[PDB]
Ligand binder design. Sequence first.
Ligand SMILES: CC(C)CCn1nc(-c2cncs2)c(O)c(C2=Nc3ccc(OCC(N)=O)cc3S(=O)(=O)N2)c1=O
Length: 557
Amino acid sequence: SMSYTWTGALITPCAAEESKLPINALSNSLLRHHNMVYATTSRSAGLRQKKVTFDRLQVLDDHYRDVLKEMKAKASTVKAKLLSVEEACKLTPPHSAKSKFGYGAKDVRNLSSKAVNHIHSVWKDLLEDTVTPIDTTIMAKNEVFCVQRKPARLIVFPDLGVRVCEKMALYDVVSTLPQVVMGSSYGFQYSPGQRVEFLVNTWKSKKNPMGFSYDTRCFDSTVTENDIRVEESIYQCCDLAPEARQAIKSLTERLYIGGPLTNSKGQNCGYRRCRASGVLTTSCGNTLTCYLKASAACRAAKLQDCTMLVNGDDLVVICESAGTQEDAASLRVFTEAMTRYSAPPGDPPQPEYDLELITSCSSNVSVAHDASGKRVYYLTRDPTTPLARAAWETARHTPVNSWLGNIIMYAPTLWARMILMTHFFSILLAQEQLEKALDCQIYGACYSIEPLDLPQIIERLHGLSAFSLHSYSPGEINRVASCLRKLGVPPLRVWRHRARSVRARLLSQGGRAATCGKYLFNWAVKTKLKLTPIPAASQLDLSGWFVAGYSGGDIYH
Ligand SMILES: CC(C)CCn1nc(-c2cncs2)c(O)c(C2=Nc3ccc(OCC(N)=O)cc3S(=O)(=O)N2)c1=O
């Protein structure tokens, strides 16, 4: 069937959009080639509409059905609980798009009677109606990039009332079933250090390791009604409260499978017959689907001893090599299978025999050295998009602080430490806003974070060695330096000098701000210290931090 049908109504913005990088007094201190940075807007939504619209055909064979039978057997061991309206409400972001029924996100979180009364009747309607398609809003994402211009990603999402109900019925399933079904292959269960650990141990576990990533063209569009149905049969394998089963079935038939698309102005835009990107189960269902197709494709291509790592639509496979040219032929057979399954490639997969050349979740493993000269593997990425985004956040306050999220995910990296930490801690000092909490996303879920808790969070996540890394690899140092040339970012030498200043200004304030100077910026001094564990770090509730993915999922912690 066609992934989408369109009436020709435009996808409309909910407010004023900017596409050129706003500039302020701080802008040039970070990035000077302002014209290489842009933000996607709703002005380009029509090209994405063309791009995500095509016919899917699926040919499902025994390898496909065998794997599914395996996954369901695992799924059968999962017990999930219904969440209460109250529990579901506190998972709602403070800033989540308001209902069309006279209440917003803060209404939800306060368990206000208007919100709770509406939520109860959506629930009841779900239990009493398994047919009537549920309405969705279609919007264009404003995301910041660097000239390669990409058209805007789209977001399709049901009303605030449906979204609370979704959590009641499926929050516990989507958090817990994926690890049980996919085991160590489920990606969102790992912190960045645990991901590096798994990749390395896996690579080492092969007699002759080969690895490749597989990038599907517009994954959401390739998801068919069969797929969304298949993943419901997985869910329904769980031990469930009868109200949960009924609601999951209802949400599957009415919403997950398909539904009408309405713009921010109230006009019908068309019909969806593929994955909606703004539903709770988006991440879990894409992960499951990508894992089923790929697993099944590993058998068609007779790839030997595969260890897959899947995060939504993002897939890396590490297997036993069969010889370079035979690996090349293998992957072509992998791709013909994936294609039959309705998941053809963007870029054709390539075999890699150097772990550090594999990109997965936009990231690669690299090596540096700790205080003792020990080799230590860490996760990193091309800093271009991080830097483009930080330029923007340098002038405009945004719903998500990518700089903050990147500091946490890439704390051990050359670029996060030397540039991101230096830049934004300088900004925060001048506004006296270190204790002001800021929203970032980690694995698609929203978190409110104090810049001041950074060294404690970084210690827990990556360990004290993130504050001591040095002697980075030549390829990593070159990729960073070269990105800086491209973007017009001061060279790493300038950052070091600025950081001695930021460090000094931080220690001057004493307390936690000083701990920030001490731990985050110890790399910037000759008279560097011994970094002992932070006392208050065990008091942090880092439970629930790397357990599941919830992108599109409207989840707050
Ligand atoms: C694997 C990590 C250790 C490093 C890279 N990284 N980084 C982040 C960051 C979050 N804030 C700053 S960076 C982050 O939130 C994610 C991340 N990974 C996803 C991957 C694939 C995804 O697929 C979406 C779908 N197809 O439905 C979704 C995500 S995510 O959960 O939004 N967040 C991520 O993978």
